[PDB]
Amino acid sequence: HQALVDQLHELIANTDLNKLSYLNLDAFQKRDILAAHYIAKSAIRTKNLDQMTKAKQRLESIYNSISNPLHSQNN
């Protein structure tokens, strides 16, 4: 499952909070991202397939979401 590991690494890199200022993500989204990275990394480290698979779907969803995001407004 090296392909899945490579996919996760790419997704983690593409959801680097340091490069996402321009998207105006709220605290909840950023916490989702930090959690997803930790889960993905921990699943790779332990070679847990179900968790690696879940982590990929979660990160794919996040990446698509924040790349087509909800307009930032205070109401």
* Comparison of 31 and 47: residue with beta carbon closer to Na ion: 31
**Smallest distance, Na ion to C-beta of residue 49, A:** 8
**Smallest distance, Na ion to C-beta of residue 13, A:** 18
* Comparison of 13 and 34: residue with beta carbon closer to Na ion: 34
Rounded to whole angstroms, how far apart are CA atoms 29 and 33?
6
Reference 61, options 25, 32, 19; nearest CA is 32
Q: Which positions touch Na ion (CB under 5 A)?
A: 21, 31
Cα separations in angstroms, 72 against 19, 24, 37: 17, 6, 24
* Comparison of 7 and 48: residue with beta carbon closer to Na ion: 48
**Smallest distance, Na ion to C-beta of residue 50, A:** 5
37 is written with which tokens? 């990275």
